[PDB]
Amino acid sequence: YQFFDLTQSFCLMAQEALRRELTDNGVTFIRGGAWNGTTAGLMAGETLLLNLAEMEKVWLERDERALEVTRTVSLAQFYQALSSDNFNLTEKLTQFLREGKGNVGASGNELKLSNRQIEASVRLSDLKIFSDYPESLGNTRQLKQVS
Amino acid sequence: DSRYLPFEGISVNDSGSLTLSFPDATDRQKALLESLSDIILHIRYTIR
Amino acid sequence: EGKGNVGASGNELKLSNRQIEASVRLSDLKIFSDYPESLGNTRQLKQVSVTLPALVGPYEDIRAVLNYGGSIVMPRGCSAIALSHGVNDSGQFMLDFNDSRYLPFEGISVNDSGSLTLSFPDATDRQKALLESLSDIILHIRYTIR
Amino acid sequence: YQFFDLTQSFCLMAQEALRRELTDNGVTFIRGGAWNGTTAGLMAGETLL
Amino acid sequence: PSISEDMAQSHNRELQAEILAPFIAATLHLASPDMARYILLWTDNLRPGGLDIAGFMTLVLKESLNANETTQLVQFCHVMAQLSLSVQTLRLSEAELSVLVISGFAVLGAKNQPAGQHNIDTLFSLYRFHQWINGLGNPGSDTLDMLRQQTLTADRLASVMGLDISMVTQAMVSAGVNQLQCWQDINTVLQWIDVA
C-alpha cells in the first residue's frame, strides 16, 4: 500500500512534468482506479504501465523541435527608448550613486536604489518579443534561458 | 541537463518582470557601478 | 524602394510585405556533379549552416528564418531554422551529430526540386541598415553519399 | 488490448523511422496478425520481437 | 473513465461494438471479448430499450441524466445478461454464435418476426440447433463452414449424417422445402426424419 502510494505520487508528478514540457494542461491519463479497494487495491501496475505508455505515445507524437532564437538586449538602450519613461540609464545610475536614494521609471520598467541594494526591473511583456518574427511556423512561444 | 536549466518555462511575453539587484551598493559597490556602463542580456527562447 | 522582385521561380530575391525573401532552389545548385557517381548510390543532404557577413555591433541582433518549401514535407519541427547572431549560426547552440533526434533539415534529397527560402522580417522597418551594410550570405551544406 | 495497440503504433513508427534512415520504402516486417482475435489477441509479443 | 467520447463518437457501429466488447465481457463475467461483441450485436438488433450502440455509450458517459431512459438502459443490460446466461446454459460455442449472428438469424429462421425475438421459440430452436451441432461429429467444422454460405447441399448433409440419400430426398419432398434456407426448414426435415 505504501509503495503504491509512492508510485502514484511519482506518476502524477511525471504527468505534470509532461504537461509542462508539452505546454498543455488538458491531457490526463492517470485517472485513478488503480487501487481497487474491493480487492486489496491490486492491478494498479498494468494500469500505470498503460498510462505511462500513453504518455510516451503522446510525447513522441506531439514532439516538435521548436525554433531556438537568441536575442541580445541592452538595458541602457531599452530604458532610453522606453515608451512611457525614457531616460538615460547611466546618468540615472550615477545620480543614484551620488545620492542616497533614487527611483525612476514605471512599474515593471524601473531603476531604483532600494535600501542598500540597487534594483533594476525590466518587464518581459514590455520587451515586444512577439513581433520579432511572424506567427507563421509557430504556435507556442516561450522563453527558456537567460544569460 | 537531467533537470530544467534556470529560468525555464516562462512565457515569451509574460506580464511578469525580471529584477536584477546588486547588494551592498551603498557601501562597498560604489566604484564597480560608477565605472559600469550598462547591462547586456542574452535571452534564448523556443517557438513551437 | 518599397517593393522589388528579381529572378525566377526557385531562385528569386524579393521584398515581400515587410519581410525580405531569398529563395534558392536545391535542384538548381548542381550538386550531383560535385563528385562522380562511383562509390555512391543514395545521395542526400543532412545539415545546413548559415553565415551572415555584415557590419554588426554589440546588442545588434539579426533576424532570419530559413524554411524549406518543397513537396516532401517531414512533420513539423525541422522544416525551418532561426538565425539570431549570424556568426556561423546553424540554428542550434551546440552542433552535435550524436543527437537522439534528427538535426534540423535532415533527410532532404541532394538535388530535390524543393527550394530553401531565407526571410528577414521587419525589413521595412527596423532592419534597414543591417542589410544595407550586409554584403551577401554564406551557406555550409553538409551531406552524405552512400 | 490498449497496451498492445500502443505497442503496435510504436513498432509501426519505428519501422517508418528505419525506412527513413535506410532511405528505402519497400522493407516491411510488421505485417499484422499479432492480435489473433480468435484467442483474445495473444502471442503478439514474440512476433513483434 | 476508461473510454470517453473522443474515440467513442466514431461512425463504425461494428468498431464501436468491438471497442465496447471487453467491457461487456468484464461486466457480465463472459468468456471472450468476441462473444461479448456478439451478445452486443444481438441486443443491438433487438433494441430492448430502443437504444443503439451510439446512444448507448453516449448515455453511459452521461452521468445518469435520464428519468426513464436509465430504466431503458438497465433493461438493455438485463437483456444482454439474459442472452449471455442463455448462451452459457446452452453451452453454445464461439463459432456457432459467430455464424448465427453473422447470418442474422436468416439461416436460423424465425416465426412472425425479423431476425428473432428473445422468447421460447428461438430458445428451443437454438437448443435443438446446438444439439445438432454436438451430434454433427468430426466433419462438423466444415459443415458449419459451408453452413455460413449457402452451399450446404442435401447429398452432402446425407453423407455427413450417414443416412440414406433417398431418405433425405423424400424428407425434402415431404417437408415441401427445396433447400435448407433456414434452420426452421432444417429442423422440420430433421423431425420428419426422426419420426420416420
Distance (Å) from the C-alpha of residue D14 to the closest C-alpha of chain C? 13
User: What span, in angstroms and rounded, lies between the C-alpha atoms of E12 and D49?
Assistant: 32
Look-up of cell digits 511572424 = A134
User: What span, in angstroms and rounded, lies between the C-alpha atoms of C131 and E76?
Assistant: 74
Q: Is C83 helix (H, G, I), strand (E, B) or coil?
A: strand
Q: What is the distance between the terminal CA atoms of chain A, rounded to a whole angstrom?
A: 46
Segment C96-102 long-range contacts (CB within 8 Å, at least 24 positions apart): C97/C47, C101/A63, C101/A65, C102/C78
Of C59, C67, C76, the CB nearest to A64: C76
Residue C74 DSSP symbol = P
User: Taking CB atoms and an 8 Å limit, are A57 and D7 in contact across chains?
Assistant: no
Burial of B29 (0-12, 13-18, 19+ CB in 10 A): middle
User: Taking CB atoms and an 8 Å limit, are E22 and D1 in contact across chains?
Assistant: yes
CB C143 within 8 A of CB C31: yes
Write out the DSSP string of E142-186. Answer: HHHHHHHTT---HHHHHHHHT--HHHHHHHHHHHT-SS--SHHHH
Resolution of this model in Å is 4.3
Q: Is C11 helix (H, G, I), strand (E, B) or coil?
A: strand
Total number of residues shown for chain E: 196
Residue C103 DSSP symbol = P
Residue of A nearest to D3 (CA): A50
Q: Which three cell numbers stand for residue E73?
A: 438502459
The H or E element that residue C146 is part of is none
CB atoms within 10 A of CB A42: 12
Half-sphere exposure at residue B46, Cβ-oriented, CA atoms within 13 angstroms: 17
Alpha-helical (H) ranges within A73-133 are 75-80, 89-98
**CA proximity to D47, closest of D37, D35, D39:** D35
Look-up of cell digits 433494441 = E47
CB atoms within 10 A of CB A89: 22
List beta partners, residue E105. none
CB C52 within 8 A of CB C87: yes
Contact of A31 with chain D, judged by CB distance below 8 Å, is answered with no
Q: Which three cell numbers stand for residue A42?
A: 491490486
Q: Which three cell numbers stand for residue A131?
A: 513581433
CB C27 within 8 A of CB C111: yes
Q: Do chains E and B touch (3 or more CB pairs under 8 A)?
A: no
Q: Which three cell numbers stand for residue E132?
A: 445438432
CB A29 within 8 A of CB A55: yes
Distance (Å) from the C-alpha of residue C76 to the closest C-alpha of chain B? 9
Q: Is C134 helix (H, G, I), strand (E, B) or coil?
A: coil
**Phi, psi (deg, nearest 5) at residue E131:** -60, -40
CA distances from E99 to A69, E92, E94, E95, E96 (A): 63, 11, 9, 6, 5
User: What span, in angstroms and rounded, lies between the C-alpha atoms of C12 and B32?
Assistant: 52
Instruction: Work out whether strand C115-121 and strand C64-68 pair parallel, antiparallel, or are unpaired.
Output: antiparallel
The H or E element that residue E58 is part of is helix E53-61
Experimental method: cryo-EM
How far, rounded to the nearest angstrom, does the alpha carbon of residue E88 sit from its chain's CA centroid?
Answer: 13
Of B9, B21, B27, the CB nearest to A119: B21
Q: Which three cell numbers stand for residue B29?
A: 559597490
List CB contacts of C18: < 8 A, sequence separation 6 or more.
C121, C122, C123, C124, C125
User: What span, in angstroms and rounded, lies between the C-alpha atoms of B12 and A147?
Assistant: 15
Q: Which residues of A touch C61 (CB under 8 A)?
A: 70-72
Look-up of cell digits 463472459 = E30
CB atoms within 10 A of CB E108: 21
Q: Which three cell numbers stand for residue D13?
A: 513508427
What is the sign of the dihedral through the CA atoms of E39, E41, E45 and E50? positive
List CB contacts of E10: < 8 A, sequence separation 6 or more.
E16
List beta partners, residue C23. C12, C117
Half-sphere exposure at residue A44, Cβ-oriented, CA atoms within 13 angstroms: 23
What is the sign of the dihedral through the CA atoms of E113, E119, E121 and E127? positive
Of C59, C82, C93, the CB nearest to B40: C59
CB A137 within 8 A of CB C67: yes
Distance (Å) from the C-alpha of residue C62 to the closest C-alpha of chain D? 34
CA distances from C118 to A102, B38, C12, C81, C112 (A): 47, 33, 11, 9, 17
| Sheet strands side by side (includes A67-74) | A67-74, B40-47, A141-146
Q: Which three cell numbers stand for residue E137?
A: 461429429
Q: Which residues of E touch A33 (CB under 8 A)?
A: 1
